[PDB]
């Protein structure tokens, strides 16, 4: 009588569910997990215990409601007859039935046309506990801070402004960055795409994260005054890291604490309609100029590390569908769109990344620019047509981090964009990157001087910065090692590794530049 296997299975995981709601059961989960953390020497025992205690409540709940829920587990184990396993199942959003206009590249701007200057800040990762002189090569996942201890007598401690290691930034270096903006300005707007807290991820309270949010927010507001700042939500803003429950999760373990703090912190910059969307799911749209829409995406609903998506990964918060409606509205008015976000779309979950790719291809004429960060390095992602994966039609700019993490100079970015006038293409025309050379800045008594590292069109000889120039650059770099070495230099903000990047390293790096869609190896067919 195997007619009972499904009854008993469901009875098992129903009892599993009830047991895992009990906090002493959750603590049992945490204790074993910590001993394995110590046994597998993942981190120091202090970090192992702290991070499991911080994560255990939310993670046990998600597993209880997804992988261990009776309908899911028994569906995996006994098949569609018993339950239904649909964890990370494929999904698709709906495009409107409006015919796609003919593909049309942006027009060259007329002589003397207005140029809008956009400051781009990402991955600031302020470390409230940064401490000069401490060990940069400590045993914790983040060093140069209180509790990192002392270096050996053979190596120096963490530099005053930062270190070339697994360390984040003292607030004074963030202050130095914004205080040196004058040469690079003036700015019409600032795009600020996430990651305010540091990587002290094993002990972050909601108050620490809010303190990071409110302190840095006030700092940029002090140095940029009247200039609008459009933020986007990074993966480090929440606690625990990457924990962004979609709006179908209510109660105090939801993201309400964080989104509302953002709506109050960013009220000076965001219109009422933006603040409403922001409070719901951490994304919004607004109009910087007549004929220009800006859309700030919360890419944590695309993230491979947002463990809440194990419950349901299908277009969380309805964001992609909301994006389509916003983009079609822009197409209807003839507006152009900027997209800003944190995690670049090539690094998203499979289904999300594929649907985003399809949206970008549909709205190629309407999308004018895309801006992401999160990787901390200086790179890009080229988008191609759906039909042949060979006509370049969009490019995402991945700007490098202000934080040193890991081992880099601090950096930031400025875009020259086809400006504020009727008929403008609103596309990026050129960009520039500024760095703080820590080797020089950390000399005792020196005053930090942020330097221009490079300008895009000048150093690569680009006629413009449209998608085809970046496509072309990748294939020039396939055959020109010196050119690729330049790019590899700039990629690390002027502080590349000493291990040379040979043939496999180059091909893997070039393949990432063409991988705007996750898990699409065909995109790199011409590289390997
Ligand atoms: C995880 O979340 C997703 C979404 O949040 C859940 O998917 C929804 O599931 C419910 C069932 O519980 C579906 O309800 C059915 O919808 C039928 C038709 O609905 C159409 O119109 C909807 C409202 O305008 C519209 O959202 C939807 O568009 C999209 O969904 C289609 C799949 O449903 C998809 O193929 C399209 O590409 C498009 O993106 C529909 O066209 C209706 O006939 C049924 O009676 C019933 O109402 C929702 O439609 C689902 N919505 C989406 C976007 O998929 C999913 O169940 C959750 N998973 C778990 C395990 O909870
Ligand atoms: C950061 O500052 C260091 C320190 O001066 C620069 O390194 C020097 O680079 C020049 C040019 O290659 C050499 O002649 C010196 O010998 C270097 N000094 C040392 C101590 O290595 C470095 O080039 C700067 N980096 C950037 C990106 O500006
Ligand atoms: C008495 C009873 O329940 N019999 C069913 C039988 O009709 C069915 O074909 C089989 C398939 O699982 O399961 C059992
Ligand atoms: C739920 C659903 O409709 N999924 C489909 C998927 O099966 C298909 O492979 C994909 C095409 O890329 O389109 C979507
Ligand atoms: C942009 O141009 C329009 C039309 O000339 C003007 O009204 C507006 O003040 C300008 N600036 C912004 C930020 O919209
Ligand atoms: C993603 N990364 C590990 C390469 C860069 C640092 O991560 P993160 O600070 O953006 O979360
Ligand atoms: Zn970051
Ligand atoms: Zn990040």
Curated annotation (Swiss-Prot):
Q: What happens after mutating residue 391 to Q?
A: In NPDB; uncertain significance
Q: Where does Zn(2+) 2 bind?
A: 195, 235, 342, 374
Quote the annotated effect of residue 197 to F.
Answer: In NPDB; requires 2 nucleotide substitutions
Describe the PTM: Proteolytically processed. Mature lysosomal form arises from C-terminal proteolytic processing of pro-sphingomyelin phosphodiesterase. Both lysosomal and secreted forms are glycosylated but they show a differential pattern of glycosylation.
Task: Tell me what happens on changing residue 392 to L.
Answer: In NPDA and NPDB
Q: What is the effect of changing residue 420 to G?
A: Loss of sphingomyelin phosphodiesterase activity. Loss of secretion
Name the chemical reaction catalysed here: a sphingomyelin + H2O = phosphocholine + an N-acylsphing-4-enine + H(+); N-(octadecanoyl)-sphing-4-enine-1-phosphocholine + H2O = N-octadecanoylsphing-4-enine + phosphocholine + H(+); 1,2-dihexadecanoyl-sn-glycero-3-phosphocholine + H2O = 1,2-dihexadecanoyl-sn-glycerol + phosphocholine + H(+); a 1,2-diacyl-sn-glycero-3-phosphocholine + H2O = phosphocholine + a 1,2-diacyl-sn-glycerol + H(+)
- Give the record's cofactor note, including how many are bound: Binds 2 Zn(2+) ions per subunit.
The UniProt similarity line reads: Belongs to the acid sphingomyelinase family.
Disease entry from the Swiss-Prot or TrEMBL record: Niemann-Pick disease A: An early-onset lysosomal storage disorder caused by failure to hydrolyze sphingomyelin to ceramide. It results in the accumulation of sphingomyelin and other metabolically related lipids in reticuloendothelial and other cell types throughout the body, leading to cell death. Niemann-Pick disease type A is a primarily neurodegenerative disorder characterized by onset within the first year of life, intellectual disability, digestive disorders, failure to thrive, major hepatosplenomegaly, and severe neurologic symptoms.
Q: Identify this protein by name.
A: Sphingomyelin phosphodiesterase
Q: Which species is the source of this protein?
A: Homo sapiens
Taxonomic placement: Eukaryota, Metazoa, Chordata, Craniata, Vertebrata
Record gene name: SMPD1
- Part of the intact protein present: 86 to 613 of 631
């Amino acid at each position: 009588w195997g007619n009972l296997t499904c009854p008993i299975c469901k009875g098992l995981f129903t009892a599993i569910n009830l047991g895992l709601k009990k906090e002493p059961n959750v603590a049992r989960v945490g204790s074993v997990a910590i001993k394995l953390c110590n046994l597998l020497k993942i981190a120091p025992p202090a970090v192992c215990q702290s991070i499991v205690h911080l994560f255990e409540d939310d993670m046990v709940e998600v597993w209880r409601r997804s992988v261990l829920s009776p309908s899911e587990a028994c569906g995996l184990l006994l098949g569609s007859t018993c339950g239904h396993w649909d964890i990370f199942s494929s999904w698709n959003i709906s495009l409107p039935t409006v015919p796609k206009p003919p593909p049309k590249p942006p027009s060259p701007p007329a002589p003397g046309a207005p140029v809008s200057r956009i400051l781009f800040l990402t991955d600031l990762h302020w470390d409230h506990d940064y401490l000069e002189g401490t060990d940069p090569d400590c045993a914790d996942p983040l060093c140069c801070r209180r509790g990192s201890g002392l270096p050996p007598a053979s190596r120096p401690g963490a530099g005053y402004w930062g270190e070339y290691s697994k360390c984040d930034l003292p607030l004074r270096t963030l202050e130095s960055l914004l205080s040196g903006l004058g040469p690079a300005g003036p700015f019409d707007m600032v795009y600020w795409t996430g990651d305010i807290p540091a990587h002290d991820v094993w002990h972050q309270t909601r108050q620490d994260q809010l303190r990071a949010l409110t302190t840095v927010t006030a700092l940029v507001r002090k140095f940029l005054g009247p200039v609008p700042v459009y933020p986007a939500v990074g993966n480090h803003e929440s606690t625990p890291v990457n924990s962004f429950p979609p709006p179908f999760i209510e109660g105090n373990h939801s993201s309400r604490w964080l989104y509302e703090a953002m709506a109050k912190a960013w009220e000076p910059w965001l219109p009422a309609e933006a603040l409403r969307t922001l409070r719901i799911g951490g994304f919004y749209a607004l109009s910087p100029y007549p004929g220009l829409r800006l859309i700030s995406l919360n890419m944590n609903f695309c993230s491979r590390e947002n463990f809440w998506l194990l419950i349901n990964s299908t277009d969380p918060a309805g964001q992609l569908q909301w994006l389509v409606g916003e983009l079609q509205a822009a197409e209807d008015r003839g507006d152009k769109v900027h997209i800003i976000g944190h995690i670049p779309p090539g690094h998203c979950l499979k289904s999300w990344s594929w649907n985003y790719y399809r949206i970008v291809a549909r709205y190629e004429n309407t999308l004018a620019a895309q801006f992401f960060g999160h990787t901390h390095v200086d790179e890009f992602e080229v988008f191609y047509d759906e039909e042949t994966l060979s006509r370049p039609l969009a490019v995402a700019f991945l700007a490098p981090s202000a934080t040193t993490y890991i081992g880099l100079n601090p950096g930031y970015r400025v875009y020259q964009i086809d400006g504020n006038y009727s008929g403008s293409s609103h596309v990026v025309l050129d960009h520039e990157t500024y760095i703080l050379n820590l080797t020089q800045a950390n000399i005792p008594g020196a005053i930090p001087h942020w330097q221009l590292l490079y300008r895009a069109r000048e150093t690569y000889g680009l006629p413009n910065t449209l998608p085809t120039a970046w496509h072309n650059l990748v294939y020039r770099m396939r055959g020109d090692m010196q050119l690729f070495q330049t790019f590899w230099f700039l990629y690390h903000k002027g502080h590349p590794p000493s291990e040379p990047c040979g043939t496999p390293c180059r091909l893997a790096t070039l393949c990432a530049q063409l991988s705007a869609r996750a898990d699409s190896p065909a995109l790199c067919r011409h590289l390997m």
